Amino acid sequence: SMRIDVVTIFPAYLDPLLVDLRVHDLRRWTHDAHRSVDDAPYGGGPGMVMKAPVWGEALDEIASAETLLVVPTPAGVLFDQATAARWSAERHLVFACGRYEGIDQRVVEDAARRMRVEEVSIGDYVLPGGESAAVVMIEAVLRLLDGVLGPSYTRPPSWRGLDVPEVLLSGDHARIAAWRREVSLQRTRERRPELLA
Amino acid sequence: SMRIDVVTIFPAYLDPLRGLVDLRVHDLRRWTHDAHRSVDDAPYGGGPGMVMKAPVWGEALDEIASAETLLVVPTPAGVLFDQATAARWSAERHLVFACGRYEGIDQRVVEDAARRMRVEEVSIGDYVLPGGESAAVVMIEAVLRLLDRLEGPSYTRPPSWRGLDVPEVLLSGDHARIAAWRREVSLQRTRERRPEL
Ligand SMILES: Nc1ncnc2c1ncn2[C@@H]1O[C@H](CSCC[C@H](N)C(=O)O)[C@@H](O)[C@H]1O
Ligand SMILES: Nc1ncnc2c1ncn2[C@@H]1O[C@H](CSCC[C@H](N)C(=O)O)[C@@H](O)[C@H]1O
């Protein structure tokens, strides 16, 4: 039903992880003895940029017109639960994992001529590579596929002088739902006030 | 200089991530006391899934953490992790990541730990992961990267590729025009993808 390809210069990074998950070494698409995937940026600046000649060949082999190409980037639109649910209905996801200063922008523009491309950030922080971001996104999608085939407490009722809220022991499904909504609302006001506009 | 302990029921998860930094991974089952080495139990108040037990977690953190520790608890209900947090955590002597699984850790673990250490409940973004291990990887990567509004596009050779040319300004050699162009693309990119910034 779903195929997921991950392209990276660090295939061992996805070892931690109906669904056919494949991980590809980007160096398989290099033609030199040094298996070179990067080169100096135009306009100067530190670091190296991943070459379009290498990425172009990798995507020519792996992706088709039906593919949804995900490019992790700290400059992309934010990944969220609505995106994970939408991507869980896809037949083919491809994750182009960037390293160094990222992939040559023309790779994305060229892919977008035949397939759908989404440049996505997992959050407002900087990772050294796109591998952990692909892992995070694949986990959120796979979690939804597994499911479609507030604070938590368990025993003991009292621990280190801290008791489970009495409402959770009441057996009253309505009062429990009302309490969980109140704690959720209080947490949102304190931690994420922007979610209440 | 910095010690990082990761506590999880999946120690092999952090294998690809591993002298200034001492990174250690602990199997949470080391602090269980039953024959089944069980870390979870049914939730109070009903609901699907299991909850990780406070006795196991309390004992693990009593051994691993001290008053100088900063305990990070991944949770989709936490304050958002960001670059400012990664920079702040890079100055810490001891970070401990309590990786949740199932429906999460019994809330009393955090309240009890906060009696003898600093605790931060942190979300890596507005999506749901099956466990906190990938979230710990993402956070540790952002901190380790530092110890080692939107970004513009990057380009490398060739100057023309599949009919797509590198912007002429990047070939001009004019540091002033290049800086002006990068500021403009950064601004346009932010307007299209993150207008709230
Ligand atoms: N917040 C984020 N979300 C998604 N991918 C990100 C990301 N931050 C970084 N990446 C990934 O990491 C790659 C390199 S970004 C630059 C990191 C490098 N240490 C440096 O100092 O330049 C990007 O191409 C992207 O794939
Ligand atoms: N956005 C996020 N940021 C940080 N940690 C998260 C997270 N989403 C999930 N987690 C981690 O994943 C654990 C389980 S929460 C969700 C999994 C649960 N089996 C379910 O299907 O509801 C949490 O305790 C936390 O450690």
Swiss-Prot record, chain A:
Basic and acidic residues bias: start-end ranges: 186-195
Q: Where does S-adenosyl-L-methionine bind?
A: 98, 122-127
Q: What is its EC number?
A: 2.1.1.228
According to its UniProt record, which reaction does this protein catalyse?
guanosine(37) in tRNA + S-adenosyl-L-methionine = N(1)-methylguanosine(37) in tRNA + S-adenosyl-L-homocysteine + H(+)
Q: Keyword set for this entry?
A: Cytoplasm, Methyltransferase, S-adenosyl-L-methionine, Transferase, tRNA processing
A GO CC term? cytosol
Keyword tRNA processing listed:
yes
GO terms in the biological process aspect are: tRNA N1-guanine methylation
Give the chief site where it resides. cytoplasm
Q: Which Gene3D superfamilies match?
A: 3.40.1280.10, tRNA(m1g37)methyltransferase, domain 2
GO molecular function list: tRNA (guanine(37)-N1)-methyltransferase activity
Q: Where in the cell is it found?
A: Cytoplasm
**Which enzyme class, named as a word?**
transferase
The answer to whether keyword Transcription regulation applies is no
Instruction: Provide the leader sequence positions.
Output: none
Q: Tell me which InterPro entries the record gives.
A: Alpha/beta_knot_MTases, tRNA_m1G_MeTrfase_C_sf, tRNA_m1G_MeTrfase_TrmD, tRNA_m1G_MTases_N, tRNA_MeTrfase_TRMD/TRM10
Family that this chain belongs to: Belongs to the RNA methyltransferase TrmD family.
Question: Could you describe the subunit structure of this protein?
Answer: Homodimer.
Task: Write out the function statement from the record.
Answer: Specifically methylates guanosine-37 in various tRNAs.
Q: What name has this protein been given in UniProt?
A: tRNA (guanine-N(1)-)-methyltransferase
From Swiss-Prot, chain B:
| Assembly, per entry | Homodimer.
Provide this UniProt record's keywords sorted from A to Z: Cytoplasm, Methyltransferase, S-adenosyl-L-methionine, Transferase, tRNA processing
Q: Name one GO molecular function term.
A: tRNA (guanine(37)-N1)-methyltransferase activity
Annotated gene: trmD
InterPro entries annotated for this entry?
Answer: Alpha/beta_knot_MTases, tRNA_m1G_MeTrfase_C_sf, tRNA_m1G_MeTrfase_TrmD, tRNA_m1G_MTases_N, tRNA_MeTrfase_TRMD/TRM10
| SUPFAM superfamilies per UniProt | alpha/beta knot
**GO cellular component annotations, sorted alphabetically?**
cytosol
The family line of this record is: Belongs to the RNA methyltransferase TrmD family.
Q: What does this protein do?
A: Specifically methylates guanosine-37 in various tRNAs.
Biased composition (Basic and acidic residues) is annotated at 188-197
Where does this protein hold S-adenosyl-L-methionine?
Answer: 100, 124-129
The organism's place on the tree of life at top rank: Bacteria
The record's EC number reads 2.1.1.228
Q: What is this protein's name?
A: tRNA (guanine-N(1)-)-methyltransferase
HAMAP family reported in the protein's UniProt record: TrmD
